[PDB]
Amino acid sequence: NRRDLRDPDRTVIASELVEHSFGVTLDKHVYAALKFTDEQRTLDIRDYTKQVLMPQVSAVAYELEDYIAELIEGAPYEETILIDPADTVPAFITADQRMGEANVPTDSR
Amino acid sequence: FTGRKVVTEVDGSFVRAVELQLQASSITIVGGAFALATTTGTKQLKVRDDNGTDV
Amino acid sequence: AHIFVKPELVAEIGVKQLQREIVLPGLVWTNPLTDFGGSKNDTITVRVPAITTA
Amino acid sequence: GLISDPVEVDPIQVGRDEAGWVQELRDREAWPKQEVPEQAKKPAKVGN
Numbered sequence: 001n002r003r004d005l006r007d008p009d010r011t012v013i014a015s016e017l018v019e020h021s022f023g024v025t026l027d028k029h030v031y032a033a034l035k036f037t038d039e040q041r042t043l044d045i046r047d048y049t050k051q052v053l054m055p056q057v058s059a060v061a062y063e064l065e066d067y068i069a070e071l072i073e074g075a076p077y078e079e080t081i082l083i084d085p086a087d088t089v090p091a092f093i094t095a096d097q098r099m100g101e102a103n104v105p106t107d108s109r
Numbered sequence: 110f111t112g113r114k115v116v117t118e119v120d121g122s123f124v125r126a127v128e129l130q131l132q133a134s135s136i137t138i139v140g141g142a143f144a145l146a147t148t149t150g151t152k153q154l155k156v157r158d159d160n161g162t163d164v
Numbered sequence: 165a166h167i168f169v170k171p172e173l174v175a176e177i178g179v180k181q182l183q184r185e186i187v188l189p190g191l192v193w194t195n196p197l198t199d200f201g202g203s204k205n206d207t208i209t210v211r212v213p214a215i216t217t218a
Numbered sequence: 219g220l221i222s223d224p225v226e227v228d229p230i231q232v233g234r235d236e237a238g239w240v241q242e243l244r245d246r247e248a249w250p251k252q253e254v255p256e257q258a259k260k261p262a263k264v265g266n
Contacts, residue, residue: 005206006231008224020119020181021174026112064111071113077128084132085160095127102124103182116179124182205233209266 030067032059133158 001013034056036045045051081098083091099109117123139155158164197208219226234240242255 006228006234008227010225022114022116022179024112024114026110028111028113030111067111067113071115072126075115075126075128076117076123077126078122081127081129082132083129091129095129098127099124103184104125105182119181204230205237206230207234207237207239211266212262 028067030060030063032056032063131160131162133160133162133164135159136164 001015003009003012034052036052081091081094100106115123116125118125136156136158139157143152145152156164197210200206200208203209238257238260240257242257244252244254244258
């Protein structure tokens with residue numbers, strides 16, 4: 001705060017300190033499940049790894065990437081910057097400006 | 110087990126990320142005028158914007 | 165079903181409130197005058213020299 | 219007066235306001251922009 005020098009009002013406005021918080025939660029369970037009859041395991045499956053396990057791990061990896069994309073895309077954006085396909089650069093300059101006026105650091109963007 | 114969070118500001122605003130989207134000026138139905146093979150036939154219509162995005 | 169009594173953990177992971185950089189104090193002519201006490205009315209008089217005409 | 223009495227008016231402050239060299243400025247957050255204050259445009263004194 002500020003006050004006039006030599007003002008006969010000798011009252012100081014006390015500042016206040018407020019600490020904030022937000023919670024991060026573990027909430028989803030991503031899985032890939034398979035079932036094979038004994039006939040399929042005995043006869044149809046030749047090598048288990050590249051015929052069963054690797055597709056399963058790839059499936060989980062892609063589902064995780066989908067999870068991340070839904071996180072990014074469903075985020076609460078107050079307004080969306082519209083890119084004019086004839087003049088696209090001003091939109092990205094606008095985006096940079098929006099994150100600059102919000103005092104967002106310029107690294108790790 | 111997975112968890113995700115969007116980090117917002119202390120007053121509730123979200124300023125750490127920015128979303129941009131292409132503008133669409135018009136849409137068209139891909140394929141133009143068409144005729145059904147049978148009376149009870151079905152066709153899946155595809156619509157594309159002026160940028161060619163499937164909308 | 166099963167009920168478990170657990171804490172509420174608090175962490176700091178480096179999310180700070182965003183604040184601006186300070187640049188204006190360095191660009192302004194600061195403290196060419198100091199002896200403000202010891203001058204009446206807390207005022208220093210700056211003299212602008214004379215310009216004449218022919 | 220008394221020590222417990224409220225702070226009285228400083229003669230230095232009175233003389234400082236009489237001289238009229240304390241900078242007054244336009245309200246930054248006012249719209250439309252305010253007119254320039256009277257002191258902000260007072261000429262330099264012919265002497266001292």
